[PDB]
Every structure is written in structure tokens, then in C-alpha cells.
């Protein structure tokens, strides 16, 4: 019931009580751990609402007060006659911040309380969505000095009137299959790119073409919009020691903005809720650039470095990997675009865990995601035991909408 | 039930049916995953089912399930249990058992090799001197002048839990750790506690940075006794770097034979509390963990100093650079001296092939991702992108508490 986590580098031991307030299911059983698997009515709504409002009033130190009780009553009245309810602005802001706070896969949660919430619940059209998104992009980007934000569109109703952003991130590059047999641009985005072209996008057929947005409002068929190019801050990638690096032709965008998730607050479901913070360097340099199924540039870089690629045991992949990541961090810094390195981010996260343990009785955390994809054990999170459990409010994965939507 | 795992790099999907044979528990619940927690006297009653389960597996593996020889053995074990409260394994079953514990070790990336274990039966051993001799022979055999061979030595099983055989060293070969009055550590900080016990037992400590610890061996629940492994049997590799000539002057070396001696081997409900086993190193065990953990030799700073990396900011990735160089050095030194070692690229790649084969032939392969993924360069290895299912099969290797915590001292 009371659980301990040990840090094996420092011997520090923390006691987790927060997991008892856990609700959703992990996918693990007593017989089998699924820790590494990427994806493991009116009567339903009111307990969810109550649970949420209870934690809200408790957080503003007004638990069991006459405003608490009054609010529980009002919401129940609204559910009874309307079959849903509307959040107060204060509750929406709290819900959003807590969904980030509870994101067990997110290393960057030391920041969770600083989130700027943009209430777009008055939005009715795809055009409205595009406006709100450009405003999000410009506010968050802040000429390179990034600020975390989320923009929240209307909640699911009967689920036939869903707001969805079809893109997985507000800003991503296109991917194209070629007669050549290989892939140009980002192979992750090949399918989406074709859906764009099929909806009518004029693709420039380049390696780094910022995708158009495909916005769906009120359950209607989605529409295409190009983000104003001057709102998309991008960084050319150079190395502080290697002159030739720049000639690889590499760039990345400054704003990571996840747009395919579902925000659940008080049992209410926000299917379009793009949020953004800023990059940890490894996301770009390790995953985006070096994953086999991504830009996959390791082979080319090692070649420019004249390393011995005859034997895996020369660690040429590893040498090149480091240099790629040095260049990402360098390029972002030189251009004054907020980025954080994996040492600095994981250290801040240990500080955040300790804060959450003393202040909240725990911090749900998924070690498989929290440990950076390079140099794992030289960052402190590697040595830190973590307990993973699902708290609400939460962000949840949701399936790509093209498998769901009917035209 | 059919469980599916996906590789996110190749889109290859596998189907696990073997997790259905799993009985022991994980630490996890539908409400909490303890995937990253390091640690998440038997009855006649419980024992025959465990025996039966084991002998059913064994007899199935040999294509003799339900044979007269199968039923004979079940009856003979049944009788031996009711009569004596325990039972003895046939050599054939011991070997199979020990091979399977390795096969089932979900935290081990080296399992492609599981069927080649050399098993040394040391169940006739009665004394600590007897244990020392068995261990020397294991070391010499496993070492094989650098052409390492995997081996396990199995001492007598638990009886009443008052007469346990134990190796007190966590590995057969490890370096001493000495805590100094100024709070610094000399040698390996991981072994300070054990070193102090060896000293209290009368070991005369050389007090250098790489002093091979003596063996502390407990036979038959008796107080442990100390023994020095003959030095000529302890193969070591001085670490140097192919391009950096100053690297030798750090004065690093490491031993070639990784040999885990603190685990418990369970077969058919029997418990073997002393069962040292050994294979060969994956480079990162030494170059990443042993050298670069902050609570181990911690040489990152001193290496990056000699490399003249910019150390004023973590975002230079000075630590990541120094780490790659150290790991290059480890692999280079081992290869140069013809001591078996495997890089993390080659090891994880072989593991994926092992794992896919295990799915085809066996219906699954329990695997602990947290441990399988190497401690540097995670996602440029194929295992990072591989979904894994972790569950507990027997025969098994289990962690056990250190004996100085539990031992009744006789005097
Ligand atoms: C402020 C800087 C931030 C940093 C450095 C950061 C860092 C990260 C990293 C490295 C990951 C793993 C992502 C991956 O590898 O795909 C992640 C995941 C995640 N982050 Fe954060 N994040 C930040 C801001 C935010 C914000 C503002 C939110 C919500 C408002 C958020 C919510 C999430 C969620 C839900 C995940 C898991 C997403 C998934 O399952 O794909 N993050 N974050
Ligand atoms: C032959 C070459 C082998 C390689 C390259 C290899 C590699 C590894 C590595 C890298 C680990 C995790 C290491 C750590 O961080 O502590 C490990 C764990 C383990 N290995 Fe293997 N191994 C090999 C042979 C064996 C053998 C022969 C056995 C037993 C017969 C074995 C059983 C285990 C067990 C039980 C663990 C978990 C240990 C623990 O929980 O501390 N391995 N192996
Ligand atoms: C199948 C599936 C499930 C799931 N939960 N997720 C995915 C997206 C994948 C996961 N991993 C890479 C890719 N996600 C793309 C990068 N995600 C950035 C997260 C982030 C970083 C910094 C600031 C932020 F606001 C947000 C796919
Ligand atoms: C507390 C605790 C629990 C547990 N299960 N385990 C430990 C030993 C830890 C694991 N990680 C560092 C340290 N022990 C390192 C020794 N591991 C060598 C594994 C190996 C490699 C190659 C060939 C072999 F035969 C065996 C501690
Ligand atoms: C199979 C495995 O769960 C998968 O590759 C995970 C591992 N850890 C990860 N960690 C992060 N931060 N992001 C990822 O996309 C993944 N992928
Ligand atoms: C907390 C965490 O589970 C712990 O540090 C683990 C992580 N993964 C590991 N993986 C290996 N192979 N060996 C280890 O000692 C550890 N330590
Ligand atoms: Zn689990």
C-alpha cells in the first residue's frame, strides 16, 4: 500500500503514497509486465466529475466548503438534464496543468505549473481552429524564447462532432515514397503526407517541407491550411568543430507541439488540445536524425568523419551519434532557440521528483521513456527507481483519425 | 491467450503464448508497474507439484512425456519426497535445469548462448576448502587463456536452510574497495562493505586500486573461510586506447571473467544457494557502469580533462564524448589481448535474433527492457525499439540477500 523507490547511485529512498489515488489500468498484471509496450454515459460521468471537483477544491484549500458543495450540485444538475457539463475557466486551467503534471512519460514536468492555457472552446469551424493554432504557434515560439502552451478546442459531445487536429504535431516535415525505392524527407509522415496530397496539397517534394495542417471541426471533414512560413521558426544544423557538417543540408524546427492526444478532465474529453514546450536535444539528434526508420543519417555522418565502419566494435555509430547531438545543441544555442540537453533535463527531473514526493506523496514516472535514448546511465534518472501509474486529469494517446472518420 | 509485441523500427509483430506457462509474480498490478524496481525452508506439500512441473518440462524436452521412464521418475521422486522430504536431481536434469534458468533469465542479453553452458556438478562438496578447489577449476576452465567459455558450478542444495552453501563474494573476481578517513574511496566503491568483512576475517589488504578480493566461502551453514585465488588464474587486461597514448597512464585494468556468485538457482523446487556462473563481458558493463558510474571508479572527469574537452557546460556533451572513448578503449584492449568481449551493437543484434527464434520455437522469450537496453547509445541498438514482455519462468536465477545479513555466526 505504501511503496518505496530507491535511487541506487545516492541511496536516497522515497515513499510513494500517491499511487493509491490511481485510477486507470496499466496493462501489467501480477503475471506479466508490459512496461515496454508503447500502447498497452450519465452514470459514468458524475463520479468522474466529483472525483475531479473534489481534487480541485482540495487544491484551493476549500474542500467541503459551501462553494465546493454548491459546485458539485450544479454540475450534477447539468449532467442530469444536458448529459454533459462545462468546466469553469479556473477548472480548465487546473485540469490542463494537472494533465501535464500526471504525464508519466514526460521528463520536463518541473515546468508543469507554468503552462499558458488558451481556451478555444468557443471555436466552431476549421478556420477558427487555424486562427487559434497560428496564435498558439506565435505565442509559444516567442522569437526563440519558448513558452509552454496548450490550446483547448470544444469537448467531445456524442462523439460524432469531434474536433481533431489530424497532424501528430503542429509542425512536422513531409515524407514521400520514390520510384528510386527509398524515402525522401521524413519516413514517419509518409501516410499523412499522401492524405494531404489526396486532399489537395501541392507538395514541393523536398526533404524538409513543413506539412499543412488538416483540421477537423465539429466532426466535419477536415480542411487544409498552410501555417504562415514566418511563424515556423527553423534551425539550420552546424557543428562547432566540423565545417563540413552544414553541407549535410540538415534543419529542424524549434517548436515541438504535440497535437494528436486527448486531454481528459473530470470525465470530459478534449480530442483536440495541441500543446507545446521545447525540445530536449536528443529528441532531434538521436531519434529524428538517427532512427533507422527516420532521417537515418548515421551512415552518412560517420563517412564524413572518416571513421572505421568496418567493425561495430570501433563504436563509429556511437562517435557519430555524439557529434550529431553536439551539433543540434550548438545550432539551437547559437540561434537563441530554447533547447535543453539530456543531462540538464534529467537532473531537473530528479529535483522535480523529489519535490513531488515531499509535496504530493509521489510522482508517476515511466522509466522506459524518461531515460534518454543515449548515454542512459550517465544521467541520474537511470539509477532512479520509478513507479508508473495512471492519474487523472491525463493526456491519452488516441488513434489516427483517418481510421475513424467517415467522409 | 495470445499476447503481441511490436518492433517499432521494423514493424515485425510477434505472438507470445509462453507467458501462459508463467506462475511466479512480477511486482506489477493492473494499478502499478514496477518495471524499474530493482528488487520488486519448504513443505512436502508445495514441493512435489514443483518437482512434477519441472519433470514434465524435462521429459517433454526429451520427447518422452508420458513414457514409462517419465512415470517411473515421477513416482521415484514422489517417494523420495514423502520419505526424505526433498529429492536429488539426476545429472541429466541438473544440466537441463541450469541451462533453462539461463534461458529464462529475462534480464540477460547474452541468452543466444544458453544451450552451451558447461555444467560442473559440485553436489559432492562438503567443505569450504572443497568449494575453493571447485571454484579454481571453474575459473581456469572458463578463462581458457582468454578464449572464454561459459560455465556454472553447482554446490549442494538447501536442506533446512540452516546448512546453506554460499559464496559470499557477489562475483568470483572483483576488486577491493577501501573507504579512507577523508571520505574518498580507493579501488571499487561497490565493494567497500565486503572488503571490510574480508579484512575483519583476517585478509591482509594490499590497499591498491585493483586488488583482487579473496574468496569468502561458506559450506554447510558453517562460518565462511577465506581463500586467495591463485593470481596466475586471474586473467586481467590493462586498458589502453587505439589513438590516445595517454590513456594507458590512467592505470586502468579490468579482469576478463565476469562470474556472478550471489544468485540462487531454483530447479524443480530445489534451491541451490551457491551456483557461481560466468560467461564473458559486454564492453559497456566495464566501460559504462564500472568505470563511469558516479558511485564506481567515476573516471569521466579525469578522462575528459586529458581529452581537453570543454567541461564548463554539460551541453558540450563532454561526458558523452569521454564515455564513447573509454568504451572504445575497453573493447580495443580486450580484442588486442585476445580476451573474449562483445560490443553492445553486436550483443543486442544477436539478442533480437535469439528472441525472434525463441518466439518461433518456444512461443515467447521473457525479457526485461530496462536491463536489456545497454547503458549508452540506447536507441541506436535494435532492442530499444523492441517491445518485450517480462514474466517469470522456472527454472530460474533469483536474487538473494547478502549472507552477512542473515548468517548465524557459530564462532
Ligand atoms: C517544457 C519543455 C518540455 C520538455 C523538455 C518535454 C520533454 C518530453 C520528452 C523528452 C518526452 C518523450 C517524448 C518522445 O520521446 O516522444 C515527452 C513526452 C511527453 N510530454 Fe513533455 N516536455 C515538455 C513539455 C510538455 C508540455 C508543455 C506538455 C503538456 C502540456 C507535455 C506533455 C507530454 C506528454 C503527454 C508526453 C508523452 C507523449 C506521448 O506519449 O507521445 N510536455 N516530454
Ligand atoms: C555468455 C555471455 C553473456 C553475456 C554477454 C551476458 C550479458 C549480460 C548482461 C550485460 C547482463 C546485465 C549485466 C548487469 O548490468 O549486471 C546480464 C545479466 C544476467 N545474466 Fe547474462 N550474460 C552472459 C552469460 C550468462 C550466463 C552463462 C548466465 C548463467 C548461466 C547468465 C545469467 C544472467 C542472469 C541471471 C542475469 C541477471 C543478473 C542480475 O539480476 O544481477 N548470463 N547478462
Ligand atoms: C504510437 C505512439 C504512441 C504514443 N504515446 N506516442 C507516439 C509519438 C512518438 C513517441 N515518441 C516519438 C513520437 N513522438 C514525437 C515527439 N514527441 C514530443 C514530445 C514532446 C517533447 C517536448 C515538448 C513537448 F511538448 C512534447 C506514438
Ligand atoms: C541489488 C541487486 C539486484 C540484482 N538482481 N542484481 C544486482 C547486481 C547488479 C546488476 N548490475 C550491476 C550489479 N552487478 C554486475 C554484475 N553483472 C554481470 C552479469 C553477467 C554478465 C556477463 C556474463 C555473466 F555470466 C553475467 C544487484
Ligand atoms: C518498444 C519501446 O517501448 C519503445 O521503443 C520506446 C522506448 N522508449 C521511448 N522513450 C521515449 N522518450 N520515446 C519513445 O518513443 C520511446 N520508445
Ligand atoms: C532503477 C533501475 O531499474 C536500475 O538503475 C537498473 C536500470 N537498468 C539496469 N540494467 C542493467 N543491465 N544493469 C543494471 O544494474 C541496471 N540498473
Ligand atoms: Zn509492469
Decide: B211 and B187 in contact? Cβ < 8 Å. yes
Rounded to an integer, what distance in angstroms lies between the CA atom of residue A249 and that of residue A232?
A: 18
Q: How far is CA B203 from CA B196, B197, B212, B228, B398, in A?
A: 9, 9, 12, 9, 29
Catalytic residues of B: 108, 111, 280, 285
**At B136, phi and psi to the nearest 5?**
-60, -45
Contacts 24+ apart (CB under 8 A), B206-214: B206/B176, B207/B176, B207/B178, B209/B175, B209/B251, B210/B175, B210/B236, B210/B253, B211/B175, B211/B176, B211/B187, B212/B173, B212/B174, B212/B175, B212/B176, B212/B255, B213/B169, B213/B173, B213/B174, B213/B175, B213/B176
Decide: B341 and B285 in contact? Cβ < 8 Å. no
The 3-class secondary structure across B8-44, one letter per residue, is CCCCCEEEECHHHHCCCCCCCCCCCECCCCCCCCCCH
CA of B106 to the centre of ligand 1 (A): 29
List chain A residues with CB under 8 Å of B370.
35-36, 367-368
Task: DSSP letter for A116, please.
Answer: E
**At B341, phi and psi to the nearest 5?**
-160, 160
With a 6 Å cutoff on the Cβ, whether A399 touches ligand 3 is no
Q: String of b and e for A22-50 (b: at least 16 CB within 10 Å)?
A: beeebbbbeebbbbbbeeeeeeebbebbe
First-to-last alpha carbon distance for chain B, in angstroms, is 55
**At B54, phi and psi to the nearest 5?**
-60, -45
**At B16, phi and psi to the nearest 5?**
-95, 115
Q: Which atom of ligand 2 is nearest to the CA of B98?
A: 30
Decide: B4 and B14 in contact? Cβ < 8 Å. yes
Indicate the SS3 state at residue B272: strand
CA distance B14 to chain A (A): 12
CA distance A370 to chain B (A): 11
Distance of CA A72 to the CA centre of its chain: 32
Catalytic residue (choose from A106, A196, A290, A363): A106
Q: How far is CA B323 from CA A58, A247, A286, A385, B302, in A?
A: 48, 28, 16, 23, 11
**What does R_g of chain B's alpha carbons equal in angstroms?**
23
Q: CB within 8 A of B78, min separation 6: which ones?
A: B48, B51
Q: How many Cβ atoms are within 10 Å of B60's Cβ, its own excluded?
A: 12
Which residue's alpha carbon is at the smallest distance from atom 22 of ligand 2? B110
Which residue's alpha carbon is at the smallest distance from atom 6 of ligand 4? B399
Indicate the SS3 state at residue A182: coil
Decide: A365 and A388 in contact? Cβ < 8 Å. yes
Indicate the SS3 state at residue A311: coil
Q: How many Cβ atoms are within 10 Å of A70's Cβ, its own excluded?
A: 10
Rounded to an integer, what distance in angstroms lies between the CA atom of residue A183 and that of residue B350?
A: 28
β-strand partners of B177: B187
Indicate the SS3 state at residue B394: coil
**At B119, phi and psi to the nearest 5?**
-105, 125
Rounded to an integer, what distance in angstroms lies between the CA atom of residue B115 and that of residue B372?
A: 19
Rounded to an integer, what distance in angstroms lies between the CA atom of residue A240 and that of residue A235?
A: 14
β-strand partners of A5: A14
Residues with CB under 6 A from ligand 1: A 100, 103, 105-108, 111, 115, 148, 150, 261, 275, 277-278, 280, 283, 340, 345, 369, 395, 397
First-to-last alpha carbon distance for chain A, in angstroms, is 49
CA distance A290 to chain B (A): 7
Q: Please give the biggest Cα pair distance in chain B.
A: 74
> Across the interface, do A31 and B8 touch by the CB < 8 Å criterion?
no
> Across the interface, do A37 and B5 touch by the CB < 8 Å criterion?
yes
β-strand partners of B178: B186
Q: How was this structure determined?
A: X-ray
Which domains are delineated in chain A?
Answer: 16-121+148-158+262-276+346-370 (3.90.340.10), 122-147+162-233+397-401 (3.90.440.10), 234-256+279-344 (3.90.1230.10)
Q: Are strands B341-342 and B281-282 parallel, antiparallel or unpaired?
A: parallel
Q: How many Cβ atoms are within 10 Å of B129's Cβ, its own excluded?
A: 13
Active site residue A109: yes
Active site residue A106: yes
Q: Which three cell numbers stand for residue B290?
A: 564500472
Resolution of this entry, Å: 2.0
Question: Chain A residue with minimal CA distance to B379?
Answer: A373
> What's the CA angle centered on A165, arms A163 and A168, to 5 degrees?
145
Q: Which three cell numbers stand for residue A335?
A: 540561434
β-strand partners of A184: A176
β-strand partners of B15: B4
Q: Please give the biggest Cα pair distance in chain A.
A: 74
Q: Going along A172-237, which residue ranges are E strands?
A: 175-177, 183-185, 213-216, 223-225, 234-236
Q: CB within 8 A of A310, min separation 6: which ones?
A: none
Which residue's alpha carbon is at the smallest distance from atom 25 of ligand 4? B278
Q: What is the dihedral of CA B4, B7, B11, B14, to 10 degrees?
A: -30
> Across the interface, do A30 and B25 touch by the CB < 8 Å criterion?
yes
Q: Which atom of ligand 2 is nearest to the CA of B150?
A: 27
Q: How far is CA B327 from CA A184, A211, B263, B322, B341, in A?
A: 34, 41, 28, 9, 12
> Across the interface, do B30 and A33 touch by the CB < 8 Å criterion?
no
Q: Are strands A262-265 and B236-238 parallel, antiparallel or unpaired?
A: unpaired
Nearest ligand atom owner, CA of B347: 2
Rounded to an integer, what distance in angstroms lies between the CA atom of residue A220 and that of residue A124?
A: 11
Decide: B289 and B296 in contact? Cβ < 8 Å. yes
Question: Chain B residue with minimal CA distance to A327?
Answer: B316
Q: CB within 8 A of B279, min separation 6: which ones?
A: B110, B113, B148, B150, B258
By most ligand atoms within 8 Å of CB, the mutation choice from B378, B384, B386, B387 for ligand 5 is: B384
CB-closest option in A28, A286, A383 to B26: A28
> What's the CA angle centered on B382, arms B341 and B290, to 5 degrees?
40
Task: Compute the 3-state secondary structure of chain B and give helix, strand, coil in percent, each to the nearest 5.
Answer: 40, 15, 45
Q: Which atom of ligand 3 is nearest to the CA of B8?
A: 1
Decide: B138 and B101 in contact? Cβ < 8 Å. no
In this structure, which residues have their CB less than 5 angstroms from ion ligand 7? A 28, 33, 35; B 28, 33, 35
Decide: A38 and B6 in contact? Cβ < 8 Å. yes
Rounded to an integer, what distance in angstroms lies between the CA atom of residue A30 and that of residue A106?
A: 26
Amino acid at each position: 500500500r505504501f511503496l518505496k523507490v530507491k535511487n541506487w547511485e545516492t541511496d536516497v529512498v522515497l515513499t510513494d503514497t500517491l499511487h493509491l489515488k490511481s485510477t486507470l489500468e496499466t496493462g501489467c498484471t501480477e503475471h506479466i509486465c508490459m512496461g515496454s509496450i508503447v500502447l498497452p454515459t450519465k452514470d459514468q460521468l458524475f463520479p468522474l466529475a466529483k472525483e475531479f471537483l473534489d481534487q480541485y477544491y482540495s487544491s484551493i484549500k476549500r474542500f467541503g466548503s459551501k462553494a465546493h458543495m454548491d459546485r458539485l450540485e450544479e454540475v450534477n444538475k447539468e449532467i442530469e438534464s444536458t448529459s454533459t457539463y462545462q468546466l469553469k475557466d479556473t477548472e480548465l486551467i487546473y485540469g490542463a496543468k494537472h494533465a501535464w503534471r500526471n504525464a508519466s512519460r514526460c521528463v520536463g514536468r518541473i515546468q508543469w505549473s507554468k503552462l499558458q492555457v488558451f481556451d478555444a472552446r468557443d471555436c466552431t469551424t476549421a478556420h477558427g481552429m487555424f486562427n487559434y493554432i497560428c496564435n498558439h504557434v506565435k505565442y509559444a515560439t516567442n522569437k526563440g524564447n519558448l513558452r509552454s502552451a496548450i490550446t483547448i478546442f470544444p469537448q467531445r459531445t456524442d462523439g460524432k462532432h469531434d474536433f481533431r487536429v489530424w497532424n501528430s504535431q503542429l509542425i512536422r516535415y513531409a515524407g514521400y515514397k520514390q520510384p528510386d525505392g527509398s524515402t525522401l524527407g521524413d519516413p514517419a509522415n509518409v501516410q499523412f503526407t499522401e492524405i494531404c496530397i489526396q486532399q489537395g496539397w501541392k507538395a514541393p517534394r523536398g526533404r524538409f517541407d513543413v506539412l499543412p495542417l488538416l483540421l477537423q471541426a465539429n466532426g466535419n471533414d477536415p480542411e487544409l491550411f498552410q501555417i504562415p512560413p514566418e511563424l515556423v521558426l527553423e534551425v539550420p544544423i552546424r557543428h562547432p568543430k566540423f565545417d563540413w557538417f552544414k553541407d549535410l543540408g540538415l534543419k529542424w524546427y524549434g517548436l515541438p507541439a504535440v497535437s494528436n492526444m486527448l486531454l481528459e478532465i473530470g470525465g470530459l474529453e478534449f480530442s483536440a488540445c495541441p500543446f507545446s514546450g521545447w525540445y530536449m536535444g536528443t529528441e532531434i539528434g538521436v531519434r529524428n536524425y538517427c532512427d533507422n526508420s527516420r532521417y537515418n543519417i548515421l551512415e552518412e555522418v560517420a563517412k564524413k568523419m572518416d571513421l572505421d565502419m568496418r567493425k561495430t566494435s570501433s563504436l563509429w555509430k556511437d562517435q557519430a551519434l555524439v557529434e550529431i547531438n553536439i551539433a543540434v545543441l550548438y545550432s539551437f544555442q547559437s540561434d537563441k532557440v530554447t533547447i535543453v540537453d539530456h543531462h540538464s533535463a534529467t537532473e531537473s527531473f530528479i529535483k522535480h521528483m523529489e519535490n513531488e514526493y515531499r509535496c504530493r506523496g509521489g510522482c508517476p514516472a515511466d522509466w522506459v521513456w524518461i531515460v534518454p535514448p543515449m548515454s542512459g546511465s550517465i544521467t541520474p534518472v537511470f539509477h532512479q527507481e520509478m513507479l508508473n501509474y495512471r492519474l487523472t486529469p491525463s493526456f491519452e494517446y488516441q488513434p489516427d483519425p483517418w481510421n475513424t472518420h467517415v467522409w
